[PDB]
Amino acid sequence: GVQTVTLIPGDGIGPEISAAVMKIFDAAKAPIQWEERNVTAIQGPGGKWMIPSEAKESMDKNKMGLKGPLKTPIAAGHPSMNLLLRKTFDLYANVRPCVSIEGYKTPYTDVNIVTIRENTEGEYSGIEHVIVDGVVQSIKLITEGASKRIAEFAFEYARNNHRSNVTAVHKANIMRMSDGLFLQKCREVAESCKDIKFNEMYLDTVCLNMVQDPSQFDVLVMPNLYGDILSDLCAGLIGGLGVTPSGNIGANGVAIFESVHGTAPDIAGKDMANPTALLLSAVMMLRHMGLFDHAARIEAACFATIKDGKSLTKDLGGNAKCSDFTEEICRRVKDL
Amino acid sequence: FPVTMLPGDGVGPELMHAVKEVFKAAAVPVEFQEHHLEKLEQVLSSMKENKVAIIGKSYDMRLRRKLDLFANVVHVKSLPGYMTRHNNLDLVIIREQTEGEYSSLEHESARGVIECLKIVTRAKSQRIAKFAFDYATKKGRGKVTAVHKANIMKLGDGLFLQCCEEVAELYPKIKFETMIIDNCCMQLVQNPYQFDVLVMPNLYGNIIDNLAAGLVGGAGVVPGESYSAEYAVFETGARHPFAQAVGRNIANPTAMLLSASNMLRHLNLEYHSSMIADAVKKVIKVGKVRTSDMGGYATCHDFTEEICRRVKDLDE
Ligand SMILES: [Ca+2]
């Protein structure tokens, strides 16, 4: 009947753009009800290692979550806010589709990349050691179970979203044991799903290739660090972090779709924020939930409002206010 | 006069062939001691005597080890005729070349739990930040940006970024910025013109070298250099596995000849350096002969032959 989504508006422009997403959803009469929570880490017993229980509990019930931009904490020992969110819900896959927006003139047209990044291991592991004076050691660890899990996820995502190819990105010529095991677990999944065409490329080669001719890529799966940087590279191909959606799949059917751009508080509260990032993420969310007919319209109207050009926000080069932008999309979906 | 020549893998021997031909055409007064591919000692002593080499492509890094080629310089600079989605670009990528995850420190701590060590030390961190600022002034560059992921790798990159900020104060004439790698990568493809001189650790230099090279025209045209405290070896800038090992008489010599000109400018035969450089850049601009990688239909010696025709005509 009606689905309740956990909604984390966050900081800065976040509550502005999340009201836009709510109103636009209401405009399209989407069976979505919102449950507003905040996730700013509270100081746990003797430290700071936990998010609010009401947040945990709400996301465990609702399974779906929409997250705006979060302020970078300034507390002394405070950890990364997405780190905590990653550990408490075991968000192991970070999906980032990059498709050129027809109404946004960029030097790259006709790009349709999905980067599947492993979010739990890799160079982004907690382990770092001072070995002796002025000599620091950082631990990258690859496990078989985590690799197979992300590999398995990448192929499943190609199946459900009708993508023809999976490409495994690695540097196994340098890190032959660690990345090698990522490659070989990717290969094992690949042999099980021969309906998906599978290849392997080297990270460095991909970046060179991506910048020249991005039309040659479909889905790309890779260990943590490579994903973190190559996902921002492809973003820069279509417009930047203002227009890229991003989801995070975790354990127990928990998924948190998020905007990845800054909290940008220099325009905060001035009705000038561009909410298309969050909204496109909310489309992924609606697609993840099976509301394809609601997603198709909402996504279709946002694409239109941009191709039109009348209503555009300062950041995309236009002069209009968020409120105007949000209203055109609302008025555009109602007749749909 | 004497230069050590390592032809290397794949088309390396073919590429270096073109360099010798151009040098004969330009009457360049350098004799190359070809060493083909333990064996490193012979090369090492050649370097100790010559102090300058040109090379193609724990594999070869043990060479970098031995000759302490700690700094890698890559010039990304759009060529006037060769048109790309990013024109009029001019950056230089300084990359520390010996540390990081490149020493093959890897083990199994449990079944299917591989652990991989990344090392970074204060010695080499400083050494490249100093080198970077030296470079920037000695070439007139405005600012240098230090690329890092110090919000995640707090100890390692943090130690790198710290040394950078320590050297940045002894060079007040040059602006100093810091940028996080995943952002710095996005920025290079939206607007690369905000950058001047980049300095990074080993792995990030592998990413940005090849990403930057694509901005300017690809592995076929982007040159590079690696410096020691005494030696200077000249090579290509984009060194990804499939850089140009694919083909025969198809490869684009543009990258090595421009690297060979840079080598001559290091040898202070700044005459031939500027001649060969100009010969290469104009042949490209006129746009008659262009190899396949540049969207033309031209064999490698076709390009090389016309380059010499132009360079011999400049001589007379
Ligand atoms: Ca990122």
Numbering used by the authors:
A (entry chain A): 3 to 338
B (entry chain B): 15 to 51, 61 to 80, 93 to 351
Question: Which sentences from the paper describe this structure?
Answer:
Human NAD-IDH is a key enzyme in the TCA cycle, which catalyzes the oxidative decarboxylation of ICT into α-KG. The α and β subunits form a heterodimer (αβ), and the α and γ subunits form another heterodimer (αγ), which are assembled into a heterotetramer (α2βγ) and further into a heterooctamer (the heterotetramer and heterooctamer are also called holoenzyme). Our previous biochemical studies demonstrated that the αγ heterodimer alone exhibits a high enzymatic activity and kinetic properties comparable with those of the holoenzyme and can be activated by CIT and ADP but inhibited by NADH; on the other hand, the αβ heterodimer alone exhibits a low activity and cannot be activated by the activators but can be inhibited by NADH.
Crystals of the αβ heterodimer with the α subunit bound with a Ca2+ at the active site (αCaβ) grew at condition II and belong to space group I4, and the structure was determined at 3.0 Å resolution with each asymmetric unit containing two αCaβ molecules, which form a dimer of heterodimers via the clasp domains. We also obtained crystals of the αCaβ heterodimer at condition II in the presence of CIT or/and ADP (both 50 mm); however, in these structures, there is only a Ca2+ bound at the active site and no CIT or ADP bound in either the α or β subunit. In other words, the αCaβ structure exhibits an active overall conformation. In the αCaβ structure, the longer side chain of Gln-132B pushes the side chain of Tyr-137B away to adopt the active conformation, which is stabilized by a hydrogen bond with the side chain of Lys-173A.
